[PDB]
Design a protein around this ligand. Structure first.
Ligand code: HEM
Ligand code: HEM
Lengths: 361, 361
């Protein structure tokens, strides 16, 4: 009857937690395989995780679960499994690596901290309840004991269940902006998200995942007028409308000039520079806010858990990231501190296990 | 109407966020005053914070608030202000310090990390939404820039709004236990929470606040059977009933023996050792779960944000803490890593400011 009772099916053509409507909370858990790891280790790990995913997501305790009462409220729990290149190396499956399974190239804007970078495998754990999420993470982490150890955990949030943004907007970030308006529609453009026919065959129903941890300099952001902040993005903070429109969902008019013949939306405005240049230069953004205990001598450690899904990182994401590196006003108040690329297996049915089509050989 | 629309009044005989039903999220922000601080600094700080509290809690932007749209959803926001000894020192008011305003005495069980200890002032910021909380914390922190800097921030959680525990229980902690059953009732025993007539006069309507950051060794806790975990506390994990009863709210029978003449609830069981020995040896527990990104070698960094409120720390809390130090089975799987004591001013009305009765002189 309430948001705690919601079960999201973990079985299908695709893994859940990608086109699944984003719930309130996320923990991205990157793990590194043990030095002893081989194909058999990786297989066992994926198989024990499959059991725990099928149980936890239906509000049943996991296999390595000593706190069953912490499992009984599923709260729309999803776990999405992604493989880093090191997993394929350790399994002896380099020959099955897609061309795009590698770190993003370096960019001038990068301030990458290796402790927020890479990972042999990732669990994107999402739920509408923080206790449910804490439990799921504890169970999945324990299950991997001796097979993989935690490399990093990035925690993020949106509004709570039953709490919609001011004026029913998509998501508010900690810069105070509306985020998610002009996203990839996987109902119209499924071929730009989902791997179908191509090589390698094990990625059928699967995708690629990018995680950029992008810090917001809120201290310098505070030095900008409202007008300068809106010019930076090309959309208003109140409604989330383009500078040229009245409502959130109005099409930005990138041809529109002011009385002096200057573009209304700046030549270096985020949404101009980030816009698709070709059909394929788009991706499913599925971002979350992060807000940490601040470091010595600062008020805040806030930013964006920028998670994107696309068929091919190199063809779809990287050309956009490369265009923003070259020019984007937003780069003056944001900086990437973490980068990770993962291959996401397709879904599975009762009796299968996640990544099975890969570990066949 | 939804949980986002809820306004908790910040005006009354007492500060809100103490007897206010606990909402989903908490951030305790400890700040340290600058060395150059004086009575005028402290007064200004409390006055600018009073404005921000009155605004943010009613879903209006703060004074130093450049992200107003992040303020529009109050989500039951409360801010509770506590003063550490250093605030009274800095204001030239040591002579107004109650006898109990000092760090707790040291205990054998203490593993206190100075970075989680003390603070000249604390903001307990509570809300049913994490974006609302992140915003409030950002506004209050910015407002103190040049008067006080952040010392630590402890973040915690319960279940999300509209999400109740399995079988309508009080709160589940990350040991999987029911927490909050045998708490101080301030409706029956208000004199054990609230300072009324006594010296010092400025604490009328006020209280004392203890924050213990208590780490859970979940790795060693996992080595215990269900029976051993229940024996440790003296209550069952499923229902939260005493070992001697059937339901959560049954009175524990501490005289009850098994067929072998052993006490049914262990002599060193948490709820036996923690029970009041005298009427005054009780306090309002208002605890939250903490779950951090784990340190390099470990699966989890989980524990309890143990926040308590009482008229007098020395008379009420410390004798209980001292009895648990002497013997408690739970001490084998928990350890305190942070300790802070604060004096909590009484409430205020439209046109007053928090702590005004102190800064009079
Ligand atoms: C802190 C970092 C960032 C912030 C605060 C941010 C914020 C925003 C905002 C406010 C919008 C407009 C609303 C929307 O359509 O979602 C937007 C759009 C977009 N952003 Fe970002 N963004 C950030 C980083 C990135 C990065 C690194 C990329 C890299 C590819 C990216 C790609 C996009 C794209 C493609 C759009 C849609 C543009 C359109 O077609 O109108 N963003 N972002
Ligand atoms: C991680 C640390 C701790 C855990 C997991 C924990 C857990 C619990 C649990 C499960 C209960 C039984 C349910 C209830 O009545 O609340 C309880 C009761 C209690 N705890 Fe703790 N506790 C911890 C630390 C402390 C500390 C440091 C104190 C310090 C004074 C304390 C004081 C109490 C009191 C007074 C009760 C009620 C006892 C009664 O009258 O039946 N606890 N705690």
């Amino acid at each position: 009857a309430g948001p705690g009772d919601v079960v999201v099916p973990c079985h299908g053509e695709h893994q859940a937690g990608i086109v699944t409507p984003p719930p309130s909370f996320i923990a991205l858990v990157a793990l590194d395989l043990a030095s002893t790891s081989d194909r058999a280790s990786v297989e066992r790990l994926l198989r024990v995780w499959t059991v725990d995913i099928e149980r936890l997501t239906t509000g049943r305790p996991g296999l390595a679960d000593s706190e069953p009462e912490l499992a009984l409220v599923p709260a729309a729990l999803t776990v999405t499994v992604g493989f880093g290149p090191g997993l394929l190396t350790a399994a002896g499956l380099r020959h099955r690596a897609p061309a795009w399974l590698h770190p993003l190239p370096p960019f001038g804007i990068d301030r990458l901290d290796p402790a927020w970078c890479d990972g042999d495998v990732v669990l994107q754990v999402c739920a509408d309840d923080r206790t449910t999420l804490a439990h799921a993470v504890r169970v999945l982490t324990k299950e991997a004991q001796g097979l993989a150890s935690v490399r990093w955990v990035q925690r993020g949030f949106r509004r709570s269940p039953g709490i919609s943004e001011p004026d029913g907007t998509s998501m508010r970030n900690l810069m105070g902006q509306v985020e998610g308006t002009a996203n990839l529609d996987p109902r119209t453009d499924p071929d730009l998200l989902w791997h179908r026919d191509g090589e390698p065959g094990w990625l059928t129903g699967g995708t690629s995942m990018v995680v950029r941890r992008i810090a917001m300099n809120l201290d310098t952001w505070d030095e900008l007028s409202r007008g300068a902040r809106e010019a930076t993005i090309g959309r208003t903070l109140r409604t989330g409308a383009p500078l040229t429109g009245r409502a959130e969902h109005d099409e930005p008019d990138l041809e529109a000039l002011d009385d002096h013949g200057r573009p209304v939306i700046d030549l270096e405005a985020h949404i101009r520079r980030a816009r698709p240049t070709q059909r394929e230069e788009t991706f499913l953004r599925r971002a979350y806010n992060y807000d940490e205990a601040p470091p010595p001598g600062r008020a805040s450690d806030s930013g964006l858990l920028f998670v994107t899904y696309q068929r091919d990182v190199d063809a779809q994401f990287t050309p956009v990231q490369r265009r923003l590196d070259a020019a984007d006003l937003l780069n003056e108040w944001t900086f990437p501190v973490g980068s990770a690329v993962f291959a996401v297996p397709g879904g599975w049915s009762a009796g299968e296990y996640v990544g099975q089509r890969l570990l066949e050989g």
